[PDB]
Structures are given as structure tokens and as C-alpha cells.
Design a protein around this ligand. Structure first.
Ligand code: HEM
Length: 153
């Protein structure tokens, strides 16, 4: 579990992400796509984008970045009591989108990378550690749902 103090660190940086959800969403997905190109293959909707400039110009990509960060934010704000929000997400990702747990680890790394770039002052080592723990709790809870359904990873 995270402590109250670690949750505070997480939500404090998150409040900053909220100031520009679209810009953060975009940078996160692009980082994911460039670092792990196999991830882009899971999106029929974005597969035609070849360059970072084409990605940056895509308004639909920016819209999806907002969707992703919006769902993540609702999870974080529950501070671990996220069963209702997590359940539907795990089911679509496992059964409909077919996203391995490892890709969830890759997007976690992209979030951390971006947060680092845009929020140095609010994103020191202590905050980075808390954010990591929160994202691991998220992945651990999702992984359990996947296991139940027969997709473990
Ligand atoms: C931070 C972790 C993630 C969050 C919170 C998240 C959230 C969402 C949401 C809220 C949706 C739309 C509703 C739905 O279908 O459930 C969605 C759709 C989808 N997600 Fe995720 N997602 C995450 C990770 C990923 C990653 C790692 C991938 C691929 C590598 C993935 C691929 C998909 C695809 C393929 C769709 C359908 C997009 C479309 O065509 O409309 N997601 N995601």
C-alpha cells in the first residue's frame, strides 16, 4: 500500500498534469510509440502514423491521450480504492484490445519520463518513487483481473 504521504506526492504532481492534459497525453503516447514500436501495432486507429511529426499533428491521437489520462486520473484519485474503475478497464484491455501486462509496464515508464521532463520541481526522487509505487499498484491489480480471465499478461 502507499502511505498518505506518498499519495499526497502523487496527487500533487497529478494536479499539474491536469493543467495540460492534452499536451501530457500526447507526449506520453508518442514516447510509448517511439520507444516500443510494437505498441503502435495494437491501435488500428493510429497505425498509419510513421513519423513523430505526423504523430504530433494528429488531433485524434491527442484526443485519445486525454481519454487515457482522464481514466488514469480517476483511478489515482481513489488512492487504491479503485475496484470499480479498474474492472472495466482490465476487461477491455485483456479481452478486446489484447494488451499484454508488459505493455502496461512500458506506458508506466513513458508516464514517468514525461512527468520528469515537464515537472522537475514537483518531480523529485521522492515523488518519482511514490509515482512508481502507484503505477505498480495499478498494474498489480490489473494483472490479477487478467489472471482471472485467463490472459495473465
Ligand atoms: C495507463 C494505462 C492505460 C489506460 C488508463 C488506458 C485507458 C483506455 C481507455 C479509457 C480506453 C477507451 C475505453 C476502452 O476501450 O476501455 C482505451 C482504449 C484502448 N487502449 Fe488503453 N489504456 C491504457 C493502456 C493501454 C496500452 C499500454 C495500450 C496498447 C499498447 C492500450 C491500447 C488500447 C486500444 C488499442 C484501445 C482502443 C482505442 C480505440 O481504437 O478507440 N491501452 N484505453
Amino acid at each position: 500500500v502507499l502511505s498518505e504521504g506518498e499519495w499526497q506526492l502523487v496527487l500533487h504532481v497529478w494536479a499539474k498534469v491536469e493543467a495540460d492534459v492534452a499536451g501530457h497525453g500526447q507526449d506520453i503516447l508518442i514516447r510509448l510509440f517511439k520507444s516500443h514500436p510494437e505498441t503502435l501495432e495494437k491501435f488500428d486507429r493510429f497505425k498509419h502514423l510513421k513519423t513523430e511529426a505526423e504523430m504530433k499533428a494528429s488531433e485524434d491521437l491527442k484526443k485519445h491521450g486525454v481519454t487515457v489520462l482522464t481514466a488514469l486520473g480517476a483511478i489515482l484519485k481513489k488512492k487504491g480504492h479503485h475496484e470499480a474503475e479498474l474492472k472495466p478497464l482490465a476487461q477491455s484491455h485483456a479481452t478486446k484490445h489484447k494488451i499484454p501486462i508488459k505493455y502496461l509496464e512500458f506506458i508506466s515508464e513513458a508516464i514517468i519520463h514525461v512527468l520528469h521532463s515537464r515537472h522537475p520541481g514537483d518531480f523529485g526522487a521522492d515523488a518519482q518513487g511514490a509515482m512508481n509505487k502507484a503505477l505498480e499498484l495499478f498494474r498489480k491489480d490489473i494483472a490479477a483481473k487478467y489472471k482471472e480471465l485467463g490472459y495473465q499478461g
